[PDB]
Amino acid sequence: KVFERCELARTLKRLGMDGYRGISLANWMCLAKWESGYNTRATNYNAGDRSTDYGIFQINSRYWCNDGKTPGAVNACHLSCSALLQDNIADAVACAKRVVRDPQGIRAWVAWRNRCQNRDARQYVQGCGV
Numbered sequence: 555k556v557f558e559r560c561e562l563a564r565t566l567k568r569l570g571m572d573g574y575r576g577i578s579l580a581n582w583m584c585l586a587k588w589e590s591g592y593n594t595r596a597t598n599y600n601a602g603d604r605s606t607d608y609g610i611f612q613i614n615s616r617y618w619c620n621d622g623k624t625p626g627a628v629n630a631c632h633l634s635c636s637a638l639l640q641d642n643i644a645d646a647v648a649c650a651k652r653v654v655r656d657p658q659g660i661r662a663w664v665a666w667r668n669r670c671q672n673r674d675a676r677q678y679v680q681g682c683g684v
Contacts, residue, residue, distance in 0.1 A: 555641040557592040557610075559583070560682035567684045569647045575654045582650075583678035584670035585663060586610050594646070595639050609638035611650045612663070618649055 557565070563583055566572070572579040589612040590596035598607040605616040605624045613631070615621045619638055620629035631649035638646045653662050660666050 555594045557586075557594070559592070559678070560684075562586065562592055563679050563682040563684050565643065566647070569644065571647065571651075572684070574651055575659060577654060577660050578675075579684060580675040580679045581660060581666070581670060584673075584675045585660070585666050587678060588665045588669045589663065594641055594643060597639070606635065608635045609646045610643055611638075611646055611653075612665075613638055613646065613649055613653065618653060 563579065566582055567579055571577070571582050574582075586592055589607075590610050592610065594610045596607075596609060596612065598612060600606065603616070605614055605627070606621060607614050608619060608621075613619060613635075615624040615635050616627045618629065618631045619633045619635035620627065621635040631652050633645055633649060638649065640646075654660055656662065661671075
């Protein structure tokens with residue numbers, strides 16, 4: 555499913571992402587925008603290390619979910635990576651929450667540093683009623 559901006563904004567808020575571990579909703583919106591373009595079926599194979607990024611937040615199979623083919627991987631979210639490709643994003647959200655409970659926080663995603671950190675991210679939630 556490809557979410558519309560405000561549609562996703564409202565959904566994330568209801569799932570309790572606003573301010574989760576100090577991360578504003580606008581930051582989560584910026585992250586999903588640059589990782590998948592708000593697309594839940596997005597997948598990306600990293601030929602360099604044999605891992606795959608799954609779903610709306612492009613969560614990596616080496617640490618967060620199990621896909622069985624990634625060498626020396628763990629499954630910290632205790633989820634099949636398949637769960638991160640559903641239209642309902644409840645599981646992807648529960649896993650993103652797990653990722654940021656680690657010391658790096660939102661910085662775990664390099665794309666966040668390049669495209670979101672120290673920027674005016676208001677634009678991602680403006681006019682959405684959240």
